[PDB]
Amino acid sequence: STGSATTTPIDSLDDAYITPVQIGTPAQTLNLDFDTGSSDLWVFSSETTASEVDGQTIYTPSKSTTAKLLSGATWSISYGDGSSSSGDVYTDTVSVGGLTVTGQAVESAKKVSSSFTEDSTIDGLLGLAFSTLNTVSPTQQKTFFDNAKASLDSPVFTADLGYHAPGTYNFGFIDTTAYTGSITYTAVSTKQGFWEWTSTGYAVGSGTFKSTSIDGIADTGTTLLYLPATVVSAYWAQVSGAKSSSSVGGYVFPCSATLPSFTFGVGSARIVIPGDYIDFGPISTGSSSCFGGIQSSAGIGINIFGDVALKAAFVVFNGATTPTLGFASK
Ligand SMILES: c1ccc2[nH]c([C@H]3CCNC3)nc2c1
């Protein structure tokens, strides 16, 4: 089997991407944030605290003839950005772009933090990291990909995120028309439950390539590119007037600037992030200070190849017995 679904930016800055997902019988379609950096499929629901729901579409398990309470199961998750959610668990039929999994753990939110409430466009998350990170207790549950894998034509999914445009998540096949040149594959460590890999280096604009190992994760659920402070300083030093602002919480730059590209290495291959991808607009409405799309990972504990990096590539998440990651230009 295969599946193919369109993923759409939630706003003009590509702050996140949403993908329609069918849950239950008859189908309830929710728009979920596909997140290769976490492993829980959770949704706004009929069980979510009423004051914490603001415009989201909710899952109502009582209206699904295939929903079953997973007795005694609870979940609770906190993401690196301060956000969190928690609740109980159903199993139900879940379909993405024509690919169907029966008995998928659908984690129903009883509580969500303010940042989730404030995103009216995101109805929940669909985790695509390794199932060892799943937070359901006392019986850990499998991701949608993990459940689908044996049935897929090939045990893979691909992320093709657009810049200011829709893109595609495919399951079970590689669309050879969706990228240019070849796909370069690189080793993955699953030791921390992430799609963790080692970039071979970077360049700023037309500058020389610096060969240096940068361990990080491929994370579709993180907006920006978070890299070591040395690398990030080298980037913003090429932008006149750019500086790190403790009050704003990262590097900012004059909105009148023209941003240089940023290149990262995948083996001997190179992925080029155009300068425009690194612009996240005025820090507040009407401001001439703009927020940068490359930021320091110093306070995080891990480097994160988020959407800013990933949307410059066609990315293969290869879930073979020994997982690997593939990157192609597009
Ligand atoms: C900013 C700070 C911390 C962050 N942690 C994350 C990801 C890492 C894996 N799941 C959450 N994005 C972040 C953005």
Atom of ligand 1 nearest to the CA of 304: 8
Residue pointed to by tokens 């593939």: 326
Longest dimension (CA), the chain: 60
Q: Output the CA 69–ligand 1 centroid distance in Å.
A: 30
Among the listed residues 198, 180, 178, the one whose alpha carbon sits nearest the alpha carbon of residue 266 = 198
Q: Output the CA 38–ligand 1 centroid distance in Å.
A: 10
Q: At a CB cut-off of 8 Å and minimum separation 6, what does 312 contact?
A: 163, 271, 272, 273, 274, 277, 329
Nearest CA to ligand 1 atom 10: 37
Q: Which helix (H) or strand (E) holds 225?
A: strand 225-227
Task: List Cα–Cα distances, 85 to 42, 72, 222, in angstroms.
Answer: 9, 18, 17
- Return the CATH superfamily for domain 5-174: Acid Proteases (2.40.70.10)
Side chain identity, residue 292: G
The catalytically annotated residue of 199, 261, 296, 297 is: 199
Atom of ligand 1 nearest to the CA of 295: 1
Q: How far apart are CA 156 and CA 31, in angstroms?
A: 22
Among the listed residues 326, 320, 322, the one whose alpha carbon sits nearest the alpha carbon of residue 266 = 326
Q: Output the CA 301–ligand 1 centroid distance in Å.
A: 9
Q: At a CB cut-off of 8 Å and minimum separation 6, what does 263 contact?
A: 202, 203, 204, 209, 270, 271, 272, 273
Between β-strands 210-218 and 303-305, what pairing exists: parallel, antiparallel or unpaired?
A: parallel
Q: Which helix (H) or strand (E) holds 296?
A: strand 294-296
- Spatial contact of 259 and 272, defined as CB atoms under 8 Å apart: no
Thinking of the domain 175-330, which architecture would CATH place it in?
Beta Barrel (2.40)
Q: How far apart are CA 262 and CA 15, in angstroms?
A: 19
Catalytic residue flag (residue 199): yes
Describe the strand order of the beta sheet including 225-227 as a list of residue ranges: 269-273, 262-266, 196-204, 210-218, 303-305, 225-227, 294-296
- 3-state DSSP assignment of residue 68: strand
Q: Cis before residue 138, ω within 30 degrees of 0?
A: yes
Q: Which helix (H) or strand (E) holds 229?
A: helix 229-236
Nearest CA to ligand 1 atom 7: 80
Catalytic residue flag (residue 46): no
Q: How far apart are CA 212 and CA 215, in angstroms?
A: 10
Resolution of the experimental model in angstroms, please? 1.3
Side chain identity, residue 163: Y
Q: At a CB cut-off of 8 Å and minimum separation 6, what does 271 contact?
A: 263, 264, 265, 309, 312, 313, 327, 329
Task: List Cα–Cα distances, 8 to 121, 209, 311, in angstroms.
Answer: 11, 33, 12
Nearest CA to ligand 1 atom 6: 80
Where in the chain do CATH 2.40.70.10 domains reside?
A: 5-174, 175-330
Q: Which helix (H) or strand (E) holds 20?
A: strand 17-23
The catalytically annotated residue of 14, 35, 92, 307 is: 35
Among the listed residues 223, 220, 139, 189, the one whose alpha carbon sits nearest the alpha carbon of residue 323 = 189
Residues framing ligand 1 (Cβ under 6 A): 37-38, 79-81, 219, 222, 300, 304
Q: Cis before residue 26, ω within 30 degrees of 0?
A: yes
Pocket test for ligand 1, best of 38, 81, 83, 195 (most atoms within 8 A of CB): 81
